[PDB]
PDB file of all heavy atoms in Angstrom:
ATOM      1  N   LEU L   1       0.833  -1.194   0.000  1.00  0.00           N
ATOM      2  CA  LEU L   1       0.000   0.000   0.000  1.00  0.00           C
ATOM      3  C   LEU L   1       0.868   1.244   0.000  1.00  0.00           C
ATOM      4  O   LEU L   1       0.602   2.202  -0.733  1.00  0.00           O
ATOM      5  CB  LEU L   1      -0.940   0.040   1.202  1.00  0.00           C
ATOM      6  CG  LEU L   1      -1.971  -1.075   1.319  1.00  0.00           C
ATOM      7  CD1 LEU L   1      -2.861  -0.762   2.501  1.00  0.00           C
ATOM      8  CD2 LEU L   1      -2.787  -1.192   0.032  1.00  0.00           C
ATOM      9  N   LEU L   2       1.872   1.241   0.877  1.00  0.00           N
ATOM     10  CA  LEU L   2       2.763   2.399   1.014  1.00  0.00           C
ATOM     11  C   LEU L   2       3.418   2.702  -0.331  1.00  0.00           C
ATOM     12  O   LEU L   2       3.552   3.869  -0.715  1.00  0.00           O
ATOM     13  CB  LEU L   2       3.851   2.098   2.064  1.00  0.00           C
ATOM     14  CG  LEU L   2       4.886   3.231   2.265  1.00  0.00           C
ATOM     15  CD1 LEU L   2       4.196   4.560   2.578  1.00  0.00           C
ATOM     16  CD2 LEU L   2       5.815   2.867   3.371  1.00  0.00           C
ATOM     17  N   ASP L   3       3.803   1.658  -1.049  1.00  0.00           N
ATOM     18  CA  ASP L   3       4.462   1.855  -2.345  1.00  0.00           C
ATOM     19  C   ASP L   3       3.581   2.550  -3.372  1.00  0.00           C
ATOM     20  O   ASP L   3       4.091   3.172  -4.293  1.00  0.00           O
ATOM     21  CB  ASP L   3       4.972   0.542  -2.922  1.00  0.00           C
ATOM     22  CG  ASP L   3       6.300   0.122  -2.321  1.00  0.00           C
ATOM     23  OD1 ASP L   3       6.959   0.948  -1.651  1.00  0.00           O
ATOM     24  OD2 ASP L   3       6.736  -1.030  -2.481  1.00  0.00           O
ATOM     25  N   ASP L   4       2.264   2.419  -3.218  1.00  0.00           N
ATOM     26  CA  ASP L   4       1.302   3.044  -4.120  1.00  0.00           C
ATOM     27  C   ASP L   4       0.882   4.445  -3.687  1.00  0.00           C
ATOM     28  O   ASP L   4       0.218   5.143  -4.452  1.00  0.00           O
ATOM     29  CB  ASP L   4       0.047   2.178  -4.247  1.00  0.00           C
ATOM     30  CG  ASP L   4       0.232   1.020  -5.189  1.00  0.00           C
ATOM     31  OD1 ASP L   4       1.113   1.102  -6.074  1.00  0.00           O
ATOM     32  OD2 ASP L   4      -0.459  -0.030  -5.111  1.00  0.00           O
ATOM     33  N   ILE L   5       1.210   4.833  -2.451  1.00  0.00           N
ATOM     34  CA  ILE L   5       0.883   6.162  -1.933  1.00  0.00           C
ATOM     35  C   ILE L   5       1.768   7.202  -2.601  1.00  0.00           C
ATOM     36  O   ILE L   5       2.955   6.971  -2.782  1.00  0.00           O
ATOM     37  CB  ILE L   5       1.082   6.230  -0.378  1.00  0.00           C
ATOM     38  CG1 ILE L   5       0.112   5.285   0.348  1.00  0.00           C
ATOM     39  CG2 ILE L   5       0.942   7.675   0.123  1.00  0.00           C
ATOM     40  CD1 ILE L   5      -1.371   5.718   0.266  1.00  0.00           C
ATOM     41  N   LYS L   6       1.183   8.344  -2.962  1.00  0.00           N
ATOM     42  CA  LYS L   6       1.922   9.451  -3.565  1.00  0.00           C
ATOM     43  C   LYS L   6       1.540  10.765  -2.897  1.00  0.00           C
ATOM     44  O   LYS L   6       0.349  11.072  -2.741  1.00  0.00           O
ATOM     45  CB  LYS L   6       1.621   9.525  -5.059  1.00  0.00           C
ATOM     46  CG  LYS L   6       2.093   8.302  -5.841  1.00  0.00           C
ATOM     47  CD  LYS L   6       2.141   8.592  -7.348  1.00  0.00           C
ATOM     48  CE  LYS L   6       2.516   7.341  -8.140  1.00  0.00           C
ATOM     49  NZ  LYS L   6       1.715   6.187  -7.664  1.00  0.00           N
ATOM     50  N   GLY L   7       2.543  11.522  -2.463  1.00  0.00           N
ATOM     51  CA  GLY L   7       2.314  12.850  -1.933  1.00  0.00           C
ATOM     52  C   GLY L   7       2.379  12.934  -0.416  1.00  0.00           C
ATOM     53  O   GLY L   7       2.126  11.957   0.290  1.00  0.00           O
ATOM     54  N   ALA L   8       2.751  14.107   0.079  1.00  0.00           N
ATOM     55  CA  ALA L   8       2.983  14.320   1.504  1.00  0.00           C
ATOM     56  C   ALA L   8       1.704  14.187   2.327  1.00  0.00           C
ATOM     57  O   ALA L   8       1.697  13.577   3.388  1.00  0.00           O
ATOM     58  CB  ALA L   8       3.616  15.688   1.710  1.00  0.00           C
ATOM     59  N   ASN L   9       0.623  14.787   1.847  1.00  0.00           N
ATOM     60  CA  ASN L   9      -0.674  14.678   2.504  1.00  0.00           C
ATOM     61  C   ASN L   9      -1.148  13.240   2.639  1.00  0.00           C
ATOM     62  O   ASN L   9      -1.613  12.844   3.699  1.00  0.00           O
ATOM     63  CB  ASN L   9      -1.731  15.492   1.747  1.00  0.00           C
ATOM     64  CG  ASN L   9      -1.325  16.960   1.543  1.00  0.00           C
ATOM     65  OD1 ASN L   9      -0.138  17.289   1.392  1.00  0.00           O
ATOM     66  ND2 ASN L   9      -2.323  17.841   1.472  1.00  0.00           N
ATOM     67  N   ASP L  10      -1.047  12.466   1.558  1.00  0.00           N
ATOM     68  CA  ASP L  10      -1.462  11.068   1.566  1.00  0.00           C
ATOM     69  C   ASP L  10      -0.543  10.209   2.434  1.00  0.00           C
ATOM     70  O   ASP L  10      -1.004   9.266   3.069  1.00  0.00           O
ATOM     71  CB  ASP L  10      -1.448  10.498   0.160  1.00  0.00           C
ATOM     72  CG  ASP L  10      -2.694  10.835  -0.609  1.00  0.00           C
ATOM     73  OD1 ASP L  10      -3.601  11.458  -0.014  1.00  0.00           O
ATOM     74  OD2 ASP L  10      -2.840  10.505  -1.810  1.00  0.00           O
ATOM     75  N   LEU L  11       0.747  10.557   2.463  1.00  0.00           N
ATOM     76  CA  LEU L  11       1.694   9.859   3.350  1.00  0.00           C
ATOM     77  C   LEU L  11       1.349  10.098   4.814  1.00  0.00           C
ATOM     78  O   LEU L  11       1.450   9.194   5.645  1.00  0.00           O
ATOM     79  CB  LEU L  11       3.141  10.267   3.047  1.00  0.00           C
ATOM     80  CG  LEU L  11       3.792   9.620   1.817  1.00  0.00           C
ATOM     81  CD1 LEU L  11       5.095  10.323   1.464  1.00  0.00           C
ATOM     82  CD2 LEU L  11       4.036   8.131   2.081  1.00  0.00           C
ATOM     83  N   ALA L  12       0.935  11.326   5.121  1.00  0.00           N
ATOM     84  CA  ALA L  12       0.562  11.695   6.477  1.00  0.00           C
ATOM     85  C   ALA L  12      -0.693  10.959   6.934  1.00  0.00           C
ATOM     86  O   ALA L  12      -0.777  10.515   8.077  1.00  0.00           O
ATOM     87  CB  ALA L  12       0.363  13.216   6.568  1.00  0.00           C
ATOM     88  N   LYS L  13      -1.664  10.822   6.035  1.00  0.00           N
ATOM     89  CA  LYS L  13      -2.899  10.113   6.338  1.00  0.00           C
ATOM     90  C   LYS L  13      -2.639   8.625   6.539  1.00  0.00           C
ATOM     91  O   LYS L  13      -3.255   7.978   7.382  1.00  0.00           O
ATOM     92  CB  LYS L  13      -3.902  10.297   5.189  1.00  0.00           C
ATOM     93  CG  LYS L  13      -4.114  11.735   4.752  1.00  0.00           C
ATOM     94  CD  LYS L  13      -4.981  11.800   3.491  1.00  0.00           C
ATOM     95  CE  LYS L  13      -6.000  12.937   3.557  1.00  0.00           C
ATOM     96  NZ  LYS L  13      -6.838  12.997   2.325  1.00  0.00           N
ATOM     97  N   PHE L  14      -1.703   8.084   5.754  1.00  0.00           N
ATOM     98  CA  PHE L  14      -1.327   6.679   5.872  1.00  0.00           C
ATOM     99  C   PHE L  14      -0.680   6.421   7.226  1.00  0.00           C
ATOM    100  O   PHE L  14      -0.994   5.445   7.889  1.00  0.00           O
ATOM    101  CB  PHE L  14      -0.359   6.275   4.737  1.00  0.00           C
ATOM    102  CG  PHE L  14      -0.052   4.791   4.696  1.00  0.00           C
ATOM    103  CD1 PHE L  14      -0.856   3.919   3.967  1.00  0.00           C
ATOM    104  CD2 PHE L  14       1.029   4.265   5.389  1.00  0.00           C
ATOM    105  CE1 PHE L  14      -0.583   2.557   3.917  1.00  0.00           C
ATOM    106  CE2 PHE L  14       1.302   2.880   5.365  1.00  0.00           C
ATOM    107  CZ  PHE L  14       0.492   2.027   4.618  1.00  0.00           C
ATOM    108  N   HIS L  15       0.246   7.283   7.600  1.00  0.00           N
ATOM    109  CA  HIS L  15       0.933   7.175   8.875  1.00  0.00           C
ATOM    110  C   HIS L  15      -0.084   7.267  10.019  1.00  0.00           C
ATOM    111  O   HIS L  15      -0.029   6.487  10.974  1.00  0.00           O
ATOM    112  CB  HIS L  15       1.989   8.286   8.973  1.00  0.00           C
ATOM    113  CG  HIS L  15       2.641   8.402  10.325  1.00  0.00           C
ATOM    114  ND1 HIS L  15       2.154   9.229  11.318  1.00  0.00           N
ATOM    115  CD2 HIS L  15       3.680   7.727  10.874  1.00  0.00           C
ATOM    116  CE1 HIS L  15       2.896   9.095  12.404  1.00  0.00           C
ATOM    117  NE2 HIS L  15       3.818   8.179  12.171  1.00  0.00           N
ATOM    118  N   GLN L  16      -1.040   8.183   9.893  1.00  0.00           N
ATOM    119  CA  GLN L  16      -2.089   8.313  10.901  1.00  0.00           C
ATOM    120  C   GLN L  16      -2.917   7.049  11.063  1.00  0.00           C
ATOM    121  O   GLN L  16      -3.084   6.585  12.193  1.00  0.00           O
ATOM    122  CB  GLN L  16      -2.982   9.525  10.608  1.00  0.00           C
ATOM    123  CG  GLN L  16      -3.635  10.121  11.851  1.00  0.00           C
ATOM    124  CD  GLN L  16      -5.019  10.713  11.576  1.00  0.00           C
ATOM    125  OE1 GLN L  16      -5.917  10.019  11.067  1.00  0.00           O
ATOM    126  NE2 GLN L  16      -5.202  11.981  11.943  1.00  0.00           N
ATOM    127  N   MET L  17      -3.351   6.443   9.951  1.00  0.00           N
ATOM    128  CA  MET L  17      -4.019   5.121   9.961  1.00  0.00           C
ATOM    129  C   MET L  17      -3.123   4.051  10.561  1.00  0.00           C
ATOM    130  O   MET L  17      -3.565   3.202  11.309  1.00  0.00           O
ATOM    131  CB  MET L  17      -4.397   4.664   8.525  1.00  0.00           C
ATOM    132  CG  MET L  17      -4.996   3.209   8.465  1.00  0.00           C
ATOM    133  SD  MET L  17      -5.358   2.322   6.632  1.00  0.00           S
ATOM    134  CE  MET L  17      -3.319   1.879   6.170  1.00  0.00           C
ATOM    135  N   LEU L  18      -1.863   4.030  10.137  1.00  0.00           N
ATOM    136  CA  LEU L  18      -0.935   3.018  10.600  1.00  0.00           C
ATOM    137  C   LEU L  18      -0.774   3.012  12.128  1.00  0.00           C
ATOM    138  O   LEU L  18      -0.788   1.949  12.768  1.00  0.00           O
ATOM    139  CB  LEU L  18       0.431   3.213   9.886  1.00  0.00           C
ATOM    140  CG  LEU L  18       1.475   2.174  10.289  1.00  0.00           C
ATOM    141  CD1 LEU L  18       0.988   0.764   9.897  1.00  0.00           C
ATOM    142  CD2 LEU L  18       2.783   2.518   9.592  1.00  0.00           C
ATOM    143  N   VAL L  19      -0.617   4.191  12.715  1.00  0.00           N
ATOM    144  CA  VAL L  19      -0.400   4.280  14.163  1.00  0.00           C
ATOM    145  C   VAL L  19      -1.631   3.752  14.901  1.00  0.00           C
ATOM    146  O   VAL L  19      -1.517   2.994  15.864  1.00  0.00           O
ATOM    147  CB  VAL L  19      -0.087   5.754  14.571  1.00  0.00           C
ATOM    148  CG1 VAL L  19      -0.043   5.904  16.080  1.00  0.00           C
ATOM    149  CG2 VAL L  19       1.260   6.172  13.975  1.00  0.00           C
ATOM    150  N   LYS L  20      -2.812   4.078  14.390  1.00  0.00           N
ATOM    151  CA  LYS L  20      -4.059   3.567  14.968  1.00  0.00           C
ATOM    152  C   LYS L  20      -4.094   2.062  14.909  1.00  0.00           C
ATOM    153  O   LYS L  20      -4.442   1.431  15.887  1.00  0.00           O
ATOM    154  CB  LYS L  20      -5.274   4.159  14.252  1.00  0.00           C
ATOM    155  CG  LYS L  20      -5.578   5.576  14.605  1.00  0.00           C
ATOM    156  CD  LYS L  20      -6.966   5.990  14.098  1.00  0.00           C
ATOM    157  CE  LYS L  20      -6.958   7.429  13.609  1.00  0.00           C
ATOM    158  NZ  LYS L  20      -6.387   8.347  14.639  1.00  0.00           N
ATOM    159  N   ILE L  21      -3.746   1.478  13.752  1.00  0.00           N
ATOM    160  CA  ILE L  21      -3.697   0.022  13.590  1.00  0.00           C
ATOM    161  C   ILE L  21      -2.703  -0.643  14.554  1.00  0.00           C
ATOM    162  O   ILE L  21      -3.008  -1.652  15.187  1.00  0.00           O
ATOM    163  CB  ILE L  21      -3.345  -0.351  12.123  1.00  0.00           C
ATOM    164  CG1 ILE L  21      -4.541  -0.102  11.208  1.00  0.00           C
ATOM    165  CG2 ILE L  21      -2.816  -1.776  12.030  1.00  0.00           C
ATOM    166  CD1 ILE L  21      -4.249  -0.391   9.726  1.00  0.00           C
ATOM    167  N   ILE L  22      -1.496  -0.094  14.624  1.00  0.00           N
ATOM    168  CA  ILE L  22      -0.459  -0.671  15.475  1.00  0.00           C
ATOM    169  C   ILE L  22      -0.896  -0.622  16.952  1.00  0.00           C
ATOM    170  O   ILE L  22      -0.731  -1.583  17.683  1.00  0.00           O
ATOM    171  CB  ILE L  22       0.885   0.114  15.307  1.00  0.00           C
ATOM    172  CG1 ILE L  22       1.522  -0.146  13.936  1.00  0.00           C
ATOM    173  CG2 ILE L  22       1.854  -0.254  16.428  1.00  0.00           C
ATOM    174  CD1 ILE L  22       1.981  -1.529  13.736  1.00  0.00           C
ATOM    175  N   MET L  23      -1.434   0.507  17.391  1.00  0.00           N
ATOM    176  CA  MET L  23      -1.738   0.681  18.817  1.00  0.00           C
ATOM    177  C   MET L  23      -2.968  -0.180  19.213  1.00  0.00           C
ATOM    178  O   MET L  23      -3.068  -0.666  20.333  1.00  0.00           O
ATOM    179  CB  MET L  23      -1.992   2.158  19.138  1.00  0.00           C
ATOM    180  CG  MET L  23      -0.747   3.063  19.057  1.00  0.00           C
ATOM    181  SD  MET L  23       0.731   2.301  20.110  1.00  0.00           S
ATOM    182  CE  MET L  23      -0.116   2.312  21.881  1.00  0.00           C
ATOM    183  N   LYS L  24      -3.863  -0.409  18.259  1.00  0.00           N
ATOM    184  CA  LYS L  24      -5.042  -1.221  18.516  1.00  0.00           C
ATOM    185  C   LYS L  24      -4.583  -2.646  18.658  1.00  0.00           C
ATOM    186  O   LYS L  24      -5.019  -3.340  19.563  1.00  0.00           O
ATOM    187  CB  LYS L  24      -6.048  -1.102  17.359  1.00  0.00           C
ATOM    188  CG  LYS L  24      -7.339  -0.382  17.737  1.00  0.00           C
ATOM    189  CD  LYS L  24      -8.353  -1.335  18.383  1.00  0.00           C
ATOM    190  CE  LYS L  24      -9.119  -0.667  19.541  1.00  0.00           C
ATOM    191  NZ  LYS L  24     -10.375   0.020  19.092  1.00  0.00           N
ATOM    192  N   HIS L  25      -3.675  -3.070  17.771  1.00  0.00           N
ATOM    193  CA  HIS L  25      -3.123  -4.427  17.769  1.00  0.00           C
ATOM    194  C   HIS L  25      -2.314  -4.674  19.029  1.00  0.00           C
ATOM    195  O   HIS L  25      -2.404  -5.741  19.641  1.00  0.00           O
ATOM    196  CB  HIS L  25      -2.242  -4.639  16.527  1.00  0.00           C
ATOM    197  CG  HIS L  25      -1.499  -5.940  16.517  1.00  0.00           C
ATOM    198  ND1 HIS L  25      -0.245  -6.088  17.071  1.00  0.00           N
ATOM    199  CD2 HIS L  25      -1.820  -7.147  15.991  1.00  0.00           C
ATOM    200  CE1 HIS L  25       0.174  -7.326  16.887  1.00  0.00           C
ATOM    201  NE2 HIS L  25      -0.765  -7.990  16.237  1.00  0.00           N
ATOM    202  N   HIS L  26      -1.533  -3.674  19.419  1.00  0.00           N
ATOM    203  CA  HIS L  26      -0.739  -3.754  20.643  1.00  0.00           C
ATOM    204  C   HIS L  26      -1.605  -3.883  21.904  1.00  0.00           C
ATOM    205  O   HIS L  26      -1.203  -4.505  22.886  1.00  0.00           O
ATOM    206  CB  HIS L  26       0.147  -2.517  20.763  1.00  0.00           C
ATOM    207  CG  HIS L  26       1.041  -2.541  21.961  1.00  0.00           C
ATOM    208  ND1 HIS L  26       2.039  -3.477  22.116  1.00  0.00           N
ATOM    209  CD2 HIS L  26       1.069  -1.769  23.068  1.00  0.00           C
ATOM    210  CE1 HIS L  26       2.663  -3.261  23.260  1.00  0.00           C
ATOM    211  NE2 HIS L  26       2.101  -2.223  23.850  1.00  0.00           N
ATOM    212  N   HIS L  27      -2.756  -3.232  21.902  1.00  0.00           N
ATOM    213  CA  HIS L  27      -3.582  -3.165  23.106  1.00  0.00           C
ATOM    214  C   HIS L  27      -4.412  -4.403  23.417  1.00  0.00           C
ATOM    215  O   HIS L  27      -4.992  -4.481  24.502  1.00  0.00           O
ATOM    216  CB  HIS L  27      -4.476  -1.939  23.070  1.00  0.00           C
ATOM    217  CG  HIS L  27      -3.761  -0.678  23.420  1.00  0.00           C
ATOM    218  ND1 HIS L  27      -4.155   0.558  22.949  1.00  0.00           N
ATOM    219  CD2 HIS L  27      -2.637  -0.468  24.144  1.00  0.00           C
ATOM    220  CE1 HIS L  27      -3.331   1.481  23.411  1.00  0.00           C
ATOM    221  NE2 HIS L  27      -2.395   0.882  24.129  1.00  0.00           N
ATOM    222  N   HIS L  28      -4.448  -5.383  22.505  1.00  0.00           N
ATOM    223  CA  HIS L  28      -4.860  -6.749  22.944  1.00  0.00           C
ATOM    224  C   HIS L  28      -4.019  -7.289  24.109  1.00  0.00           C
ATOM    225  O   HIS L  28      -2.876  -6.857  24.348  1.00  0.00           O
ATOM    226  CB  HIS L  28      -4.797  -7.731  21.784  1.00  0.00           C
ATOM    227  CG  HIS L  28      -5.757  -7.414  20.687  1.00  0.00           C
ATOM    228  ND1 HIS L  28      -6.980  -6.823  20.919  1.00  0.00           N
ATOM    229  CD2 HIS L  28      -5.669  -7.589  19.346  1.00  0.00           C
ATOM    230  CE1 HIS L  28      -7.607  -6.650  19.768  1.00  0.00           C
ATOM    231  NE2 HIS L  28      -6.834  -7.108  18.797  1.00  0.00           N
TER     232      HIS L  28
END
């Protein structure tokens, strides 16, 4: 997915989603 992302705004949104995913997974 990251490889298909283009642009700073879209990279920022991806990172924002990613952190949510990681922290949700961690909190099990």
Side-chain angles (χ1 to χ4, degrees):
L1 298 185
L2 178 54
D3 279 347
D4 281 336
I5 296 291
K6 296 196 184 47
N9 306 32
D10 278 356
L11 282 168
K13 310 173 139 180
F14 187 89
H15 172 269
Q16 207 213 56
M17 175 187 75
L18 181 62
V19 172
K20 285 193 217 308
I21 286 178
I22 289 294
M23 291 309 299
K24 248 276 141 90
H25 173 271
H26 183 65
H27 282 153
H28 296 328

